[PDB]
Every structure is written in structure tokens, then in C-alpha cells.
Structure 1
């Protein structure tokens, strides 16, 4: 009822949306992995009379539920989606999106990693993002490659109209003490990549992590701290 959704408020198999700013929502869904249940976020950005989706809802049925929730709550068509790295919480559901007519996009690095992992593969390659510090425009957002962090391919997304920074899985929520699933991370480079984010987007007003609650700029330094505590 207005608080940021968690697993305890999302009915089984459903998705919730949360209004972040004018024309900006996050989407929240729950999934089980290796016997534990996790929340995950994505983003929705209004693009005139269409919508841009960032990240799937972590699985085929969750992503179908996401599309239905969007139609119920917003009622504008999702025409494009970007996945911000190759893990299932970002691409699992891309087949559902594609079959619904959504054009799906990711960097070439994410596409290669997804294919090699056996994960669903976005259709279209996003060039211009292969070097740390690169940025490109995509509809109403900027896509930025900060360098290796949670994964070597992770992208962040900035919504300039609202000063919303969607960090994806390179950014952790404030309540975290641990650094999440680091199987594919570069813990040594992650703080440098976070520093690049901080330098590029110093006016961000909302920071959204890939899992957990949004907050402010503090999420960036906090993420560096938790990653360093893990590495130690």
C-alpha cells in the first residue's frame, strides 16, 4: 500500500510496480534460485506514448505477469527492452518479450555471455558501450558502461528527465551487509567502476539497485564498502 514492495507483499507469481518519478517506475518480482527466494528490480520509462523496459522480471512467467501488470497499471505498449547484464534476473523472460512483439536489446558482451550460459538472448546488439566510461542514448535514457563490477558486462541506466540512476546489479541496497551473488564479479575493479558512476552522475536523486530498496546517492559508496568487505 505505498511502501516499496517486497517478497512479503507480492502474491505468488505476480509483479508489482512502484512509481519512482513522473514517467518512471520500477518493477519488482520474486524468484527462487538454488532453494532460496529473492526479489529483483527492473525499470519502466515512458517514451511518449510507448514504454521502454529495462530488465526482465526474472523468468518467463514472471515476465508475462509483468506485461499484464503494465497493461493494467499504465496501459501503454512496451516496444523495446534493454537487459543490463547476462544473468537470468536480467534476460530470463526475453523469449516472452520477443514473442509479445517487444524488440529486445543488450550489449554484444551481454549477448555472448548469455548465449554461453544457456540464458535467453536479446535480439539486438547495443554498440558504443565496449569501453569503460562509454555512454549512448536509447530513447528517454542514457546507457552507461562503468566497467566490470557485479559482472564484466553490467550496464547502468540514467533517466535525465528525472535524475533517476538505475544501477542494476552493480549497485546494492543500503540494508545489505554482503555483496550478493558474486560468481561472475570483478571485486577488485568494482570500486573503480562505482567511482566512475559517481563521477558521471553526480546529480542523481534516486538510485535503484538490482535487488532491494531504492535510495539516494549513498547506495554507491555503500556498494563499494560491501564489495571491499567481501574481498577482505
Structure 2
């Protein structure tokens, strides 16, 4: 009823939207993995009379439910989606999107890693993001490659109209006690990559992590802190 929805508030298979700013929503879904249930976030950005989606809802059924929730709450068509790295919480559901008329995009590195790992593969490659500090425009957002962090391919998304920074899985929520799923992470480079984000987006007003509650710029420093302590 107004607060950001939490893992225990969302059954696996339902999706909720949360209004972040004018023309900006997050999407929240839950999924089971190795016998535990986790929430995960994505983003929706109004693009005139169309919508840009950032990340799937972590699975085919969750992503179908996401499209239904968008039609109920917003009523504009999703025409493009970007996946911010290759894991299933970002690309799982790309096949559902592709069958619902959505053009799916990711960096070449994400596409190669998704294919090698057996995950769903976005159709279109996003060039111009291969060196850390690179940024490109994509409709109403900027895409930014900060360097290796949670994964070597992770991208960040900024909505300049609203000063919303979507960190994806490179950014953790304030309550986090470790660096999440570090299976594909570079703990040594991650603080440097977060510092690049901090330097590039000093006017961010909302920061959204890949999992958990949005907050402000403090999420970036907290992420650096928990990553350094995890490595140690």
C-alpha cells in the first residue's frame, strides 16, 4: 500500500510496479534459486507513447506477468528492452519479450556470456560500451559501462529527465550484508567501478539496486564498503 515491495510481500510469479518519478517505474518480482527466494528489480522508462524496459523479471512466467502488469497500470506498449548483464535475473524472459514484439538489446559481451552460459540471448548488440567510462544514449536513457563489478559486462542506466540512477546488480541496497551472488564478480575492480559511477552521476537523486530497496547516492558508498569487506 505505498511502500517499496519486499521479497516476502511478492509471491513467485507475480510482479509489482513502483512509481519512481514522472515517467519512471521500477518492476519487482521474486524467484527461487538454489532453494532460496530472492527479489529483483528492473526499470520502465516512458519513451513518448512507448516504453523502454530495462531487464526482465527473472524468468519467462514472471516476464509474461510483467507485461500484463504494465498493460494494466500504464497501458503503453513496450517496444525495446535492454538487459544490463547476462544472468537469468536480467535476460530470463527475453524469449517472452521477443514473442511479444519487443526488440531486445544488450552489449556484445553480455550476448556472448549469455550464450556461453545457456541463458536467453538478446537479439541486438549495443556497441560503444566496451571500455570503462563509455556512455551511449538509448531513447530516454543513458547507458554507462563502469567496469567490472558484479560481472564483467554489467551496465548502469541513467534517466536524465529524472536524475534516476539504475545501478543494476553492480549496486546493492543499504541493508545488504555481503556482496550478493559473487559467482562472476571482480571484487578487486568493483570499488573502482563504483567510483566511476559516483564521478559520472553526481546529481543522481534516486539510486535503484539490482535487488532490494531504492535510496540515494549512499547506496554507492555502501556497495563499495560491503564489497571491500567481502573480498577481505
* Structure 1 and Structure 2 fold alike (TM over 0.5): yes
Q: Tell me the distance in 2 between the aligned counterparts of 1:69 and 1:52.
A: 15
Could you say what the CA RMSD is over the residues aligned between the two structures, in angstroms?
0.5
Please state how far the C-alpha of 1:127 moved relative to its aligned partner. Answer: 0.1
Matched residue SS, 1:8: helix
Aligned to 1:3: 3
Work out whether residues 12 and 29 of structure 2, in 8 Å CA contact, stay in contact via their aligned partners in 1.
no
SS of residue paired to 2:90:
helix
**Runs of 4+ residues deviating >6 angstroms:** none
Deviations 1:139-195 (A, max 9, x none): 000000000000000000000000000000000000011110000000000000000
Equivalent pair of 2:61/2:93 in contact (CA under 8 Å): yes
- TM-score in terms of structure 1 length: 0.99
SS of aligned partner of 1:65: helix
Q: CA deviation at 1:205?
A: 0.2
Q: CA deviation at 1:6?
A: 1.3
Contact 2:28 2:57 in 1 (8 A): yes
Structure 2 unpaired stretches of 5+: none
State how far apart, in whole Å, the 1-side matches of 2:39 and 2:180 are. Answer: 12
Provide closer, same or farther for how the CA distance between residues 11 and 133 of structure 1 changes in structure 2, counting only shifts above 3 A: same
Do 2:11 and 2:30's aligned partners in 1 also have CA atoms closer than 8 Å? no
Name the structure 2 match of 1:168. Answer: 168
| Structure 1 Cα separation of the partners of residues 93 and 13 of structure 2 | 14
Report which stretch shifted further, 8-17 or 100-109: 8-17
Whether the aligned pair in 1 keeps the contact of 2:56 and 2:93 (CA below 8 Å) is: yes
In the aligned structure 2, how far is the partner of 1:98 from the partner of 1:149? Answer: 28
The TM-score with structure 2 as length reference comes to 0.99
Deviation at residue 13 of structure 1 after TM alignment: 1.4
Q: CA deviation at 1:12?
A: 4.1
Q: CA deviation at 1:66?
A: 0.1
